[PDB]
Amino acid sequence: YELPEDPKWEFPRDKLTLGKPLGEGAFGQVVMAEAVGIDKDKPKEAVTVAVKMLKDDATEKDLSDLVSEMEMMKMIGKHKNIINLLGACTQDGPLYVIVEYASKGNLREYLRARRPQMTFKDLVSCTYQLARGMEYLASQKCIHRDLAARNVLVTENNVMKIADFGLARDINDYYKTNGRLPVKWMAPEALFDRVYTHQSDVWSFGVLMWEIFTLGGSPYPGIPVEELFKLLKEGHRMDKPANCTNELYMMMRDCWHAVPSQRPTFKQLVEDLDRILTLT
Numbered sequence: 001y002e003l004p005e006d007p008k009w010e011f012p013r014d015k016l017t018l019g020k021p022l023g024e025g026a027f028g029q030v031v032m033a034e035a036v037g038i039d040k041d042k043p044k045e046a047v048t049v050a051v052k053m054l055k056d057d058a059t060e061k062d063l064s065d066l067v068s069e070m071e072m073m074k075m076i077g078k079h080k081n082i083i084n085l086l087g088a089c090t091q092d093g094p095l096y097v098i099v100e101y102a103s104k105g106n107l108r109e110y111l112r113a114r115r116p117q118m119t120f121k122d123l124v125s126c127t128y129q130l131a132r133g134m135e136y137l138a139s140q141k142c143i144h145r146d147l148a149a150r151n152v153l154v155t156e157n158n159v160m161k162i163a164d165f166g167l168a169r170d171i172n173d174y175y176k177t178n179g180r181l182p183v184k185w186m187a188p189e190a191l192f193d194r195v196y197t198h199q200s201d202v203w204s205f206g207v208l209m210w211e212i213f214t215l216g217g218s219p220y221p222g223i224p225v226e227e228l229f230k231l232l233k234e235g236h237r238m239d240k241p242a243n244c245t246n247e248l249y250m251m252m253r254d255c256w257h258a259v260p261s262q263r264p265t266f267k268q269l270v271e272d273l274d275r276i277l278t279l280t
């Protein structure tokens with residue numbers, strides 16, 4: 001009933017001051033906190049952080065899931081476009097997973113709140129940053145499996161950070177999966193063949209692009225979940241967002257290629273988005 005010690009990551013409880021609630025999810029809660037000395041380069045400095053922890057109604061699975069999410073985040077190096085693990089309180093008390101704080105909340109709500117305010121370039125920038133994050137994550141041989149606007153967080157300075165590593169897996173060929181992945185963001189091979197590769201994340205990235213350019217629109221609007229399985233198999237794809245250029249639309253469509261190897265890689269998406277951003 002204990003958690004093994006990992007000194008590299010342990011943070012003293014007496015240096016953490018819990019603050020306002022940030023959000024309640026399915027299996028846990030997140031609260032703002034002040035952490036003193038969590039940056040080992042500035043040992044007396046107070047830093048605002050986010051703390052993930054169990055709720056009073058936690059299940060056994062919630063605990064093991066939170067531990068597993070922490071362990072996944074440990075394996076992922078630091079990157080500007082991902083929410084990084086800062087430390088954890090794992091001994092002699094409730095499990096606290098301490099991560100970077102993003103003051104502007106999740107991307108879906110951020111965009112929906114700025115509907116007529118975002119410029120087109122701002123949207124392309126957002127997309128570019130997220131491609132860069134995914135390129136990094138793929139380079140670390142991590143498949144996210146839950147890429148979506150609700151799982152991107154935005155910092156005070158509008159840096160886009162990929163978050164929510166609960167479903168992410170280390171594949172240092174392909175991860176083999178009743179499915180627990182949000183259906184509207186899943187590549188067909190994930191949905192039908194229980195197979196997951198970096199190219200499955202690329203499909204998800206395409207849905208994310210659609211969410212971004214529709215300023216937080218809901219995917220496959222009006223289609224009941226049970227029908228989506230059939231429609232996806234038959235080649236159904238969403239319409240071009242109004243905000244979108246031909247170039248960006250073709251990019252989304254390519255992310256939704258039926259053949260995984262025919263989708264762009266994240267490296268290719270970053271290269272293309274860099275260019276577009278530059279010419280915008």
Ligand SMILES: Nc1ncnc2c1ncn2[C@@H]1O[C@H](COP(=O)(O)OP(=O)(O)CP(=O)(O)O)[C@@H](O)[C@H]1O
Pocket residue numbers: 022023024025026027028029030050083099100101102103105106146150151153163164
């Ligand atoms: N590092 C952070 N900084 C600021 N807010 C955060 C945060 N991490 C999480 N939140 C917010 O805390 C809430 C709970 O998110 P959480 O990831 O725990 O559950 P969830 O069920 O919403 C998974 P999903 O990411 O698929 O929505 C959300 O409102 C989220 O936006």
